[PDB]
Design a protein around this ligand. Structure first.
Ligand SMILES: [Ca+2]
Ligand SMILES: [Ca+2]
Ligand SMILES: [Ca+2]
Ligand SMILES: [Ca+2]
Ligand SMILES: [Ca+2]
Ligand SMILES: [Ca+2]
Ligand SMILES: [Ca+2]
Ligand SMILES: [Ca+2]
Ligand SMILES: [Ca+2]
Ligand SMILES: [Ca+2]
Length: 166
């Protein structure tokens, strides 16, 4: 189901489930990830995560919020955003790179610049992915099998996930 594929991508952005995407969906996601890792909002890494999340919101709103009211409806996403995301996925993933870079920093619990598969799964659950599925997705992100999930793995995976195939 092509339509269900679309709905899945919408749900990932609609973190609070209320049928439209707001800046608050993104800030709420940042809040939940910081809480999962015990990283303070006011810390350098906390500020970088909120900043990246806000930038991703602006990137999505720029593509999808066609009436300018700073809510992206299901209709706006389905009728507008899907094609545009499919047509320019790498450019969209670049708008997410500050968020994704900041998220890696949050999930690096020992400070060595690397993130485990297990901690990648924790991040995904903070973003609403059920625990079993999150383990499966985290594992799939480790494309070279060294047990670590890095930026060169997550940025193209993000680009691919938001390319809803026809
Ligand atoms: Ca919402
Ligand atoms: Ca709202
Ligand atoms: Ca701030
Ligand atoms: Ca709108
Ligand atoms: Ca680490
Ligand atoms: Ca978890
Ligand atoms: Ca559990
Ligand atoms: Ca399972
Ligand atoms: Ca890896
Ligand atoms: Ca590697």
């Amino acid at each position: 189901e092509y339509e269900r594929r679309i709905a899945a991508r919408f749900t990932t952005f609609d973190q609070d489930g209320n049928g439209h995407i707001d800046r608050s969906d993104f800030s709420g996601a940042a809040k939940a990830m910081l809480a999962e890792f015990g990283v303070a909002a006011r810390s350098d890494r906390g500020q970088a995560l909120y900043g990246g999340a806000e930038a991703l919101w602006q990137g999505l709103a720029g593509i999808a919020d066609r009436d300018g009211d700073q809510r992206i409806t299901r209709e706006e996403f389905v009728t507008g955003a899907v094609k545009r995301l499919r047509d320019k996925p790498d450019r969209f993933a670049e708008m997410a790179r500050p968020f994704l870079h900041a998220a890696l920093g949050v999930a690096d619990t020992d400070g060595d610049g690397a993130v485990t598969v297990a901690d990648t799964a924790r991040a995904l659950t903070a973003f609403g992915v059920p625990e079993d599925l999150a383990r499966q997705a985290a594992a799939a992100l480790d494309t070279d099998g060294d047990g670590k999930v890095g930026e060169t793995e997550i940025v193209p995976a993000f680009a691919r996930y938001f390319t809803v195939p026809a």
